[PDB]
Amino acid sequence: GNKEKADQQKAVTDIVALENALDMYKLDNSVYPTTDQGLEALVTKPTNPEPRNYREGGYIKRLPKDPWGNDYQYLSPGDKGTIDVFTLGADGQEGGEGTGADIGNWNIQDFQLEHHHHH
Ligand SMILES: [Ca+2]
Ligand SMILES: [Cl-]
Ligand code: NA
Ligand code: NA
Ligand SMILES: [Pt+2]
Ligand SMILES: [Zn+2]
Ligand SMILES: [Zn+2]
Ligand SMILES: [Zn+2]
């Protein structure tokens, strides 16, 4: 019902937010954060490597939690594209259907409302 569609839109909103914050990091610092620096690099200046041009206050106000209480996941370099930003969904596991499906930057349009789709 409403709950599941709201949860899905929340995941879309967060993944897009994070992807945009990651692009700002790249614009400043010439590279994306590594998997090991993590999404935390968006709020706190990382090490290994230390970025050259870190923005005061970071790149996002806070790290969102996914609709099922788990942290969003991140890989750089990604398996699915240059970076992977994703949630594993309601089942907290790879793959799955329904609310269990994995939502990521690579397939994000699929989980957006219909007006974002290309048919
Ligand atoms: Ca899943
Ligand atoms: Cl299109
Ligand atoms: Na840390
Ligand atoms: Na990707
Ligand atoms: Pt920015
Ligand atoms: Zn981007
Ligand atoms: Zn829209
Ligand atoms: Zn569609």
- DSSP-assigned letter for residue 75: E
Measured in Å, residue 118 CA sits from the centre of ligand 2 at 5
Q: Supply the DSSP symbol for 44.
A: S
Q: From ligand 4's centre to the CA of 58, what distance in Å?
A: 22
Which residue, 78, 76, 79, 72, is CA-closest to 103? 72
Q: For tokens 């957006």, what's the residue?
A: 112
SS3 20: helix
Report the separation in Å between the CA atom of 16 and the middle of ligand 4, taken as the mean of its atom positions: 12
Dihedrals phi, psi of 52, to nearest 5 degrees = -70, -40
Q: How many other C-beta atoms lie within 10 A of the C-beta of residue 118?
A: 4
- 76-88 b/e (C-beta count within 10 Å ≥ 16 → b): bebeeeebbbbbb
Q: How far apart are CA 70 and CA 78, in angstroms?
A: 20
Q: Tokens 């930057």 correspond to what residue?
A: 105
State the Cα–Cα distance between residues 19 and 83, nearest whole angstrom. 9
Give the start-to-end residue ranges of the domains of the chain: 1-106
Q: Residue with structure tokens 């999404």?
A: 39
> Which ligand number lies closest to the CA of residue 117?
8
Q: With b meaning 16 or more CB within 10 Å and e meaning fewer, what string describes 22-43?
A: beebbeebeebbeeebbbebbb
CA distance to 80, 85, 94, per residue, from 47 (Å): 25, 20, 29
103 in Cβ contact with 15 (< 8 Å): yes
Q: How far is the CA of 82 from the centre of ligand 4 (A)?
A: 6
Question: Distance between CA 85 and CA 78 in Å, rounded?
Answer: 8
Q: Report the CATH number of the 1-106 domain.
A: 3.30.700.10
- What six digits make up the tokens of 107? 């397939």
Counting ligands in written order, which one lies closest to the CA of residue 110? Answer: 8
CA of 84 to the centre of ligand 1 (A): 15
